[PDB]
Design a protein around this motif. Sequence first.
Motif, mmCIF file in Angstrom:
data_model
loop_
_atom_site.group_PDB
_atom_site.id
_atom_site.type_symbol
_atom_site.label_atom_id
_atom_site.label_comp_id
_atom_site.label_asym_id
_atom_site.label_seq_id
_atom_site.Cartn_x
_atom_site.Cartn_y
_atom_site.Cartn_z
ATOM 1 N N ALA A 105 43.516 45.302 44.041
ATOM 2 C CA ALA A 105 43.014 44.138 43.337
ATOM 3 C C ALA A 105 41.931 43.379 44.061
ATOM 4 C CB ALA A 105 44.158 43.198 42.972
ATOM 5 N N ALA B 94 37.963 48.429 46.121
ATOM 6 C CA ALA B 94 38.022 49.376 44.996
ATOM 7 C C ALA B 94 39.138 50.431 45.155
ATOM 8 C CB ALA B 94 36.666 50.050 44.807
ATOM 9 N N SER C 178 38.891 43.409 42.963
ATOM 10 C CA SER C 178 38.334 42.780 41.758
ATOM 11 C C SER C 178 38.732 41.301 41.574
ATOM 12 C CB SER C 178 38.785 43.551 40.526
ATOM 13 O OG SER C 178 37.902 44.613 40.262
ATOM 14 N N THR D 134 39.642 37.466 49.409
ATOM 15 C CA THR D 134 38.197 37.552 49.546
ATOM 16 C C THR D 134 37.616 36.208 49.984
ATOM 17 O OG1 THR D 134 37.995 39.308 47.899
ATOM 18 C CG2 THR D 134 36.011 38.029 48.388
ATOM 19 N N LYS E 101 25.508 45.480 38.346
ATOM 20 C CA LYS E 101 26.759 44.828 37.971
ATOM 21 C C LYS E 101 26.800 43.352 38.389
ATOM 22 C CE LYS E 101 31.777 45.258 38.445
ATOM 23 N NZ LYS E 101 32.917 45.993 39.057
ATOM 24 N N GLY F 297 42.679 49.899 44.331
ATOM 25 C CA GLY F 297 43.891 49.635 43.582
ATOM 26 C C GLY F 297 44.785 48.612 44.259
ATOM 27 N N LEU G 277 23.728 41.264 46.705
ATOM 28 C CA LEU G 277 25.115 41.262 47.148
ATOM 29 C C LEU G 277 25.274 41.974 48.501
ATOM 30 C CD1 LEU G 277 28.249 40.948 46.912
ATOM 31 C CD2 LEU G 277 28.211 43.021 45.490
ATOM 32 N N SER H 221 41.196 40.660 35.815
ATOM 33 C CA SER H 221 42.241 40.203 36.724
ATOM 34 C C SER H 221 41.865 38.937 37.476
ATOM 35 C CB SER H 221 42.561 41.304 37.722
ATOM 36 O OG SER H 221 41.394 42.053 37.990
#
Length: 326
Positions: A105, A101, A107, A43, A72, A103, A58, A141
Amino acid sequence: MVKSGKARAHTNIALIKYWGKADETYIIPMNNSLSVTLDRFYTETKVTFDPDFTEDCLILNGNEVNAKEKEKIQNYMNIVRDLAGNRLHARIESENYVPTAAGLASSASAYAALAAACNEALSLNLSDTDLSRLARRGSGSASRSIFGGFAEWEKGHDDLTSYAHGINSNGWEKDLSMIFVVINNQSKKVSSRSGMSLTRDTSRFYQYWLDHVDEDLNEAKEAVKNQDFQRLGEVIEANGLRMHATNLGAQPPFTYLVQESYDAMAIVEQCRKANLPCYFTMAAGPNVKVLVEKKNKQAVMEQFLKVFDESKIIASDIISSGVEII
Ligand SMILES: Nc1ncnc2c1ncn2[C@@H]1O[C@H](COP(=O)(O)OP(=O)(O)OP(O)(O)=S)[C@@H](O)[C@H]1O
Ligand SMILES: C[C@@](O)(CCOP(=O)(O)OP(=O)(O)O)CC(=O)O
């Protein structure tokens, strides 16, 4: 006057899973956690603080996000505001050089990139340990993505003690590699967060998860200390599957796994039989990660190509370096 920061954080996939939270509000995990950091996925977030703003914005992949997504990012910017001393609202511009989003990662890279950008912007001079503490409040994470190579999230008992550190593998990470099998590119139906939440609260197999998690971690740790690939693979493969078993025990039960995920596991097995040492793990979603020593990357990767469309096989190196300002 106006403050800005820009960081790049890479993603991490957990070999020993983080799954389940002790405290839902500070993101304190139920168990310690061990991951590798990948240089193919990342990112890039820039953040700008302005006396002109009246709420936080955002922009993700070019698009302003929805209003629970806004919510959020608001609660996180709030955490940053308390810690910084000020009242400024921010505008965030983040590109996911990685599926979102899904799977894989996003996040972890997202919130490491952000926290590190906030640090630079507001001139916070945060120690790596405090950085990790910060990213953790955005996404569990993310704590591990502050660092490169193998890293570990120590669960602690409160906000000050729950954070991550790096681990020396004497650059064993340099001889390693992770093949991504990209079965589904899109949003999880159930987010890592809420699936974790339901499994943690209700799963009849969760206790079984917890009784084995620490034994796995030491074994994985002794594996990195010796550079025994086989030893490491075996435990992380079982650990990962055990994590997914806990979802089958939830009320009501569920799974991130699809037939294709299984097909992929089989090819790993055939590879192992054909004398190509490799092991698999799966984050929260259908996609499959395949740990393989660098030497056999091509061979193993070839085996998948016999079955999967080539817009779906993706080899990453493990990066040795942590999050960087840009
Ligand atoms: N660059 C970003 N900045 C802010 N939020 C992001 C960014 N990328 C993803 N997100 C958020 O990440 C959330 C989804 O992440 P997850 O549900 O955890 O799936 P993930 O990407 O696989 O991450 P995991 O759980 O660590 S595997 C979404 O709600 C997004 O809002
Ligand atoms: C350990 C995981 O399976 C799940 C972690 O997902 P998140 O870290 O995004 O959950 P939150 O803390 O709620 O943000 C990831 C993995 O690498 O296997």
